[PDB]
Design a protein around this ligand. Structure first.
Ligand SMILES: [Zn+2]
Length: 544
């Protein structure tokens, strides 16, 4: 009965989706699918983060409009997420009319309420190109060790950090011209005015403990004002009444969460839901799935902007850690920087969804994709525990009993053990204790395969007069499979579809209370095949 708006962080439009993105989108999708299974109104929202100087410059280098470039990357992103069955209700763009109007609205309110401050800043400027240079578009000689061809605010030889104004013989990465210091009036959001409000939220107990602790460090350091403006030339939204000034992506990007929802409402012809979810009196829940590097922004800057423009604030932030592969940060040279598109050439989506889900929890801890363990765990758990309950039993049902399951449960006590677990498993999905849910599900799968082993259908099948026993055993196993696949339905959407076709029924959370009795099932080919390390080796080689 809840109304829930759930987002993932927005992929940048100038790079391909990789396994780090997929950890976040899969985590959110599992949670979203479970909430839908429990009957809630769920809106799962994302968008490409499509503005800014890097995007402007990349399009110029490619010789195409920024609109053409971001459109092509938007399609690529959405193809990859669709390949992993990420079930968004809307995937939009920060470059949209909805976000333009909302960014202009929120800025106007912030300004009228006294939260926008004008400040003159000094920044390196390319006089040939005619633009201010972001730090990483300045290169030069490290002032400390004198190594040439260093970029931005740090030296990759001696490790020194410094302002790029300290680079020796600086050069524009764009044009090669020598940059010079130039003044410009910028507009700053007065985040420090919201410190008391944000401190109250931190101690309210809603946020993850690790996040609340990090926020205390930020309050201790002292909140700063944040620039929300950029000078032309830019790719983004022009600031009303400020010719030559644009909104910086810090302002327009999270408003894209609202723009994407407004777009969804407008496409649906729904004239009430936008205010129902975003006005201050909302009874809807708003949740952001984000990574560690996005916590400052989503926990301090964003709720402050919402408060200052008279909108509701997030109900909670759900933060995950970094992805590692074989224990280390993804490494292009080792072939462990793996694109989502590459993954799907070698493995299915369900395999990675399962593996990540088995490792995830409600804490901020890095998640390791150990590729040897991936092969072992998928084969052990999906092929040999869960799918095995269907594959070892369905053949006898189809070949000797015309596809018909027994009229009664062979072991109702065991079945109740399985359905009694729904409360703890569902609470684990709800609380984002995904690894706990999977551990409980696989413990049940072990019990189910122990039951089948004890009954020994490969013996019963050869013994005269034991047809009824065989049907009873195999039907019991199939009903245990039905329950386990219901618990896994948020995790494994494609296997679930194959399971539903075999079982001739949609899997619903409450449906497990009614076993399949006197019920026709269908034949199937292979519900899920084994994987091997040769495939892992090919994935790594393809990614180098
Ligand atoms: Zn140096």
């Amino acid at each position: 009965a809840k109304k829930i708006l759930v987002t993932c962080a927005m992929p940048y439009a100038n790079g391909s989706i990789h396994l780090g993105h997929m950890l976040e989108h899969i985590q959110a999708d599992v949670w979203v699918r479970y909430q839908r299974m429990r009957g809630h109104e769920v809106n799962f929202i994302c968008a490409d983060d499509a503005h800014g100087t890097p995007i402007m410059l990349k399009a110029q280098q490619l010789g195409i409009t920024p609109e053409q470039m971001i459109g092509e990357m938007s399609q690529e992103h959405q193809t990859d997420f669709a390949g992993f069955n990420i079930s968004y209700d809307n995937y939009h763009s920060t470059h949209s009319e909805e976000n333009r109007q909302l960014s202009e609205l929120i800025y106007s309110r912030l300004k009228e309420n006294g939260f926008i401050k004008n400040r003159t800043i000094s920044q390196l400027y390319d006089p040939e190109k005619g633009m201010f240079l972001p730090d990483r578009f300045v290169k030069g000689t490290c002032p400390k060790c004198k190594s040439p061809d260093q970029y931005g605010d740090n030296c990759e030889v001696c490790g020194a950090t410094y302002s790029p104004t300290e680079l020796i013989e600086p050069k524009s990465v764009v044009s090669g011209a020598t940059p010079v210091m130039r003044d410009s009036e910028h507009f700053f959001f007065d985040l420090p005015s919201f410190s008391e409000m944000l401190q109250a939220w931190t101690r309210s107990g809603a946020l993850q403990e690790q996040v609340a602790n990090k926020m205390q460090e930020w309050f201790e350091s002292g909140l700063q004002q944040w620039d929300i403006s950029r000078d032309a030339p830019y790719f983004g939204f022009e600031i009303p009444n400020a010719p030559g000034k644009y909104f910086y992506v810090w302002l327009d990007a999270p408003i894209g969460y609202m723009g994407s929802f407004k777009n969804l409402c407008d496409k649906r012809g729904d004239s009430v839901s936008f205010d129902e979810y975003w006005k201050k009196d909302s009874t809807a829940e708003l949740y952001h799935f984000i990574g560690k590097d996005c916590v400052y922004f989503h926990s301090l800057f964003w709720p402050a902007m919402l408060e200052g423009s008279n909108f509701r604030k997030p109900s909670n932030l759900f933060v995950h850690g970094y992805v590692t592969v074989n224990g280390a940060k993804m490494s292009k040279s080792r072939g462990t920087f793996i694109k989502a598109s590459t993954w799907l050439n070698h493995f299915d989506a369900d395999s990675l969804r399962y593996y990540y889900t088995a490792k995830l929890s409600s804490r901020i801890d890095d998640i390791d994709l150990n590729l040897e363990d991936f092969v072992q765990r998928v084969n052990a758990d999906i092929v040999n525990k869960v799918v095995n309950l269907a594959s070892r039993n369905a053949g006898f049902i189809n070949k000797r009993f015309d596809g018909v399951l027994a009229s009664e449960l062979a072991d109702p006590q065991l079945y109740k053990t399985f359905t009694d677990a729904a409360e703890v498993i569902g609470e684990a999905w709800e609380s984002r204790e995904f690894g706990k849910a999977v551990r409980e599900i696989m413990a049940l799968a072990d019990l189910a395969n122990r039951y089948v082993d004890e009954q020994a259908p490969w013996v019963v099948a050869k013994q005269e007069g034991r047809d009824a026993d065989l049907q009873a055993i195999c039907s019991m196993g199939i009903n245990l499979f039905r329950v386990l696949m219901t618990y896994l339905k948020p995790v494994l959407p494609k296997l679930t579809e194959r399971a539903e076709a075999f079982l001739n029924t949609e899997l619903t959370w409450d449906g497990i209370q009614q076993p399949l009795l006197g019920h026709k099932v269908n034949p199937f080919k292979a519900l899920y095949n084994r994987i091997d390390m040769r495939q892992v080796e090919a994935l790594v080689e393809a990614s180098k």
